[PDB]
């Protein structure tokens, strides 16, 4: 049996930890929902 | 519950309590991924939000009324991935997202990588706009991953 309890407010905070790259990559779409790698 | 904010999705079916994902509510609707509820009910309190909306294939599902998110990324701005780990604080992440290269369209994509519990976290434009949901995607040549920018459409 699922429940929630709440985490936060959704704003955006000045300041917060930048982290991350941008990739640019070839996907696909299965009908399941899946994302796979097409080279 | 149904004041606007981020939620943690739980359950007590295995040791303990487990997060099994992250959620919206906005607007009365709660919206999450399809993987982490696999459209079953949720209990609030002492309240039940029953499944309204939901497609395996774009893996989202809408509870109490139909998809209410209709922000967008604008192909050019960095975004911040509100996380919210299991066992941990809600923590804002700011990155600029790549691309996912699909025959139906480019899709933005975040490169952070949380425990699988965090799937359904919300990311964020500069207005606090949720432009989309974390949790679905791939894993790249190194082994690290890399979401979609999930958006529903409002009907
Ligand atoms: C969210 C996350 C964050 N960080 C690391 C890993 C994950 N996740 C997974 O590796 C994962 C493994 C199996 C299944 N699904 C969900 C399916 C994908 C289509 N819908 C079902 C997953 O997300």
Redesign the pocket.
Same mark, same amino acid.
């Given at each position: 049996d699922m429940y929630i309890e709440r985490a936060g407010d959704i704003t955006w905070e000045k300041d917060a930890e930048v982290t991350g790259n941008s990739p640019r990559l070839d996907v696909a779409l299965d009908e399941?929902?899946?994302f796979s790698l097409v080279e | 519950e149904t004041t606007d904010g981020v939620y943690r999705v739980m359950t007590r079916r295995l040791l303990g309590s487990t997060q099994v994902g992250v959620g919206v509510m906005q607007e009365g609707v709660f919206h999450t991924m399809?993987?982490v509820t696999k459209g079953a009910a949720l209990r609030s309190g002492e309240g039940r939000l029953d499944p309204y909306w939901g497609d395996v294939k774009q893996?989202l599902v809408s509870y109490c009324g139909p998809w209410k998110l209709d922000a967008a990324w604008d192909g050019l701005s960095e975004v911040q991935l509100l996380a919210v780990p299991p066992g941990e604080r809600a923590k804002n992440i700011q990155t600029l997202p790549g691309i996912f290269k699909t025959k139906d369209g480019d899709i933005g994509a975040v490169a952070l990588? !949380?425990?699988?519990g965090?799937?359904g976290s919300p990311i964020l434009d500069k207005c606090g706009r949720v432009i989309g949901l974390y949790?679905?995607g791939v894993?790249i040549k190194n082994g690290s !991953?890399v979401?979609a920018i999930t958006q529903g459409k409002r009907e």
């Open positions: 399941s929902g899946d | 399809w993987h893996d990588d !949380y425990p699988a965090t799937s949790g679905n894993v !991953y979401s």
